[PDB]
Structure formats: structure tokens, C-alpha cells
């Protein structure tokens with residue numbers, strides 16, 4: 001799923017705007033500077049210095065209008081403090097969605113804001129406020145249908161270098177903390193890999209051990225990923241087990257670690 | 267609808283005593299976004315901790331990565347301590363390593 005999107009987090013105080021290529025953050029908005037911070041050289045995409053100036057001014061008046069806009073309309077819409085508004089919008093096909101208090105609330109479809117039905121009349125009356133200026137809704141449409149597609153094309157091009165790099169995983173073995181009585185928990189850690197897709201299993205020779213429980217893939221600050229895979233086994237049955245890792249960056253040469261040495265012990 | 271954080275603790279590299287490493291605490295799946303997260307060394311707060319920009323998942327729940335550069339010793343225990351409106355008390359998750 002190749003997509004770019006912008007998110008807005010506003011808490012009622014706190015106002016955060018950032019841009020994302022899926023998991024990867026590419027832009028940040030600094031309000032006091034009132035500028036768009038580019039997190040990578042290629043974050044500018046194939047867009048020129050002057051066109052970025054244009055986008056900043058749009059981001060300028062739009063964020064501050066909307067932030068203060070919510071800030072003013074609260075009592076009307078029965079918004080009780082504290083509350084949070086989140087929106088995300090971008091393209092892949094386009095989308096723009098707003099949540100209130102962590103739930104689906106309204107979304108932008110074609111040319112106007114429509115209330116999610118399960119969100120009551122509170123959402124419908126927010127849509128009346130949001131659908132006042134039709135021209136401003138028309139600007140929103142064009143941002144999503146025109147600007148965002150153009151942008152994501154340049155961005156992927158300019159970022160192709162970074163985006164299609166291969167970083168080899170490293171792996172290691174340890175004892176897991178919560179084994180049942182008579183049992184051990186073997187854990188195989190895999191870190192430092194990019195891109196994300198990865199394969200890891202506990203093995204007895206060529207036989208994959210189907211008890212292998214793979215955790216979530218977790219991020220590292222350097223942009224690589226982390227995963228742990230655990231296997232519960234009877235203690236008298238942990239001999240000859242190995243952890244096998246496959247990854248695009250290894251070109252066929254799996255990492256293979258063996259449950260042995262002080263781990264066994266002896 | 268309030269959502270309590272999931273808290274996962276991990277190191278960037280295998281633990282090797284006297285070798286520089288990174289300690290991570292990934293806190294996710296929570297709502298509202300107001301949260302307090304500390305990395306602890308021997309029960310004491312670690313001063314220089316960085317975190318990612320606040321973001322959220324498809325289901326609108328928030329997530330953050332906290333991390334710090336550190337050098338483990340035989341003696342030291344590390345953990346992540348989290349407080350959130352969903353928690354009647356700060357929740358503490360240890361860094362499990364073999365020593």
C-alpha cells in the first residue's frame with residue numbers, strides 16, 4: 001500500500017501536524033516558525049522552493065483557522081473539556097477523516113463533510129459548520145485529488161534511494177521470563193532489519209516448530225525494525241532447537257542460531 | 267472510550283556488559299494521548315530520554331517510542347514506567363535480559 005498522508009492532533013493547547021509515508025515520518029510543522037520542517041533531504045519531493053512557500057502559507061492559515069475554529073465552536077457542538085480531535089488525510093484514491101474522543105466522527109467525501117451515521121446529530125451539526133464555505137471545501141477536494149497525487153509521485157522518486165535500501169538483521173537468543181512449570185521459554189530476538197517483511201521460526205532441524213509465537217514488529221529510532229519470537233517447550237526437550245531468520249537483505253543466506261552453551265546449560 | 271497502553275521493552279543490540287546499546291520502550295494503543303513515560307535504571311529515572319513525535323494508528327489509538335543510549339553492567343536493572351488515566355497506578359515493565 002503506497003500512500004502519503006498528513007495527520008493533525010489537537011487537544012483541548014496542543015496542536016501537532018505531521019506528514020507520513022506509511023510508518024515513515026517525512027514532515028513536521030512548527031507553528032511558532034510557522035514553517036514546514038523537512039525531515040529528509042528528499043522530503044521536498046520534486047517540488048520547488050517557491051511552491052513549498054505556497055504550501056506553507058496554506059498550511060499556515062488552515063491550521064490556525066481550524067485549531068482556533070474548534071476552540072470557538074465547542075459549546076455549540078456540546079464538546080466537553082478535555083477532548084481531542086484527530087484527523088488524517090492523504091492519498092494512495094484519496095481520503096480525509098476526523099475523529100472526536102478517539103472515535104469516527106466525520107469524513108470528507110467528494111466535495112463536502114459527511115457525518116458518520118453512528119456519530120449522532122452532534123456530528124451532523126459539526127458538518128453544517130464545516131460545510132459553510134463551499135469554496136473552502138472545493139480547495140480541500142483539490143488538495144486531496146490533485147496536489148496529494150502529484151506530491152506522492154515526486155516524493156517516492158526523490159526518496160527511492162532511502163526507501164529501497166536493504167539493511168541486514170542481527171539476531172540473538174535468551175531465556176523468556178514467564179515459562180509454565182517444567183517448561184522453558186526460548187526467545188529469539190531479531191533487530192536492525194529493513195525493510196519490514198521478515199520471517200522467523202524456531203526449528204528442530206528442517207522442521208518448523210509451530211509453537212513459535214511471533215510478537216509485534218517494533219520500531220527503533222534509527223528507522224529499522226525489531227521482533228521477538230518465542231517458543232515454550234518442556235525443559236527436557238530443548239536440545240537441538242535453533243532459531244532461523246529469513247530476510248530480503250540476506251539473499252538466501254539465513255541467520256541460524258542454536259540453543260546451546262550456557263543457555264542449555266553446558 | 268479510554269484505551270490503556272500496551273508497553274513493550276527491548277534493546278537495539280544483544281546485551282553485552284560494558285558495551286554501548288539503546289534501550290527502547292514502545293508504548294501504543296492508548297487514548298487519550300496525555301501520557302507520562304520514564305525509563306528507569308535501578309528504580310531511578312534516567313535523565314536523557316528521547317521520544318518520537320506523537321502519532322496514531324488506523325483505529326485512532328496513539329503510540330510513541332521512548333529510547334536512550336546506555337551501557338549495561340552486571341549490576342543494573344532497567345525498566346519502563348508508564349502512567350495514564352486508564353491506570354490506577356504506574357505500570358512498570360522490566361527489560362528482560364539473561365545475566
Ligand SMILES: CCCCCCCC/C=C\CCCCCCCC(=O)OC[C@@H](O)COP(=O)(O)OCC[N+](C)(C)C
Pocket residue numbers: 006007008017018019027028029030035036037055059062063064066067069087088089090096098130140143144147148151
Ligand atoms: C507540515 C507537515 C505536513 C506537510 C505536508 C506537505 C505536502 C502536502 C501534500 C498533500 C496535500 C495535503 C493532503 C491532506 C490535506 C487534507 C485537507 C485538509 O484541510 O487537511 C488539513 C489537515 O491535515 C491539517 O490541519 P487542519 O486543517 O487543522 O485539519 C482539518 C481542519 N478541520 C476544520 C476540518 C478540522
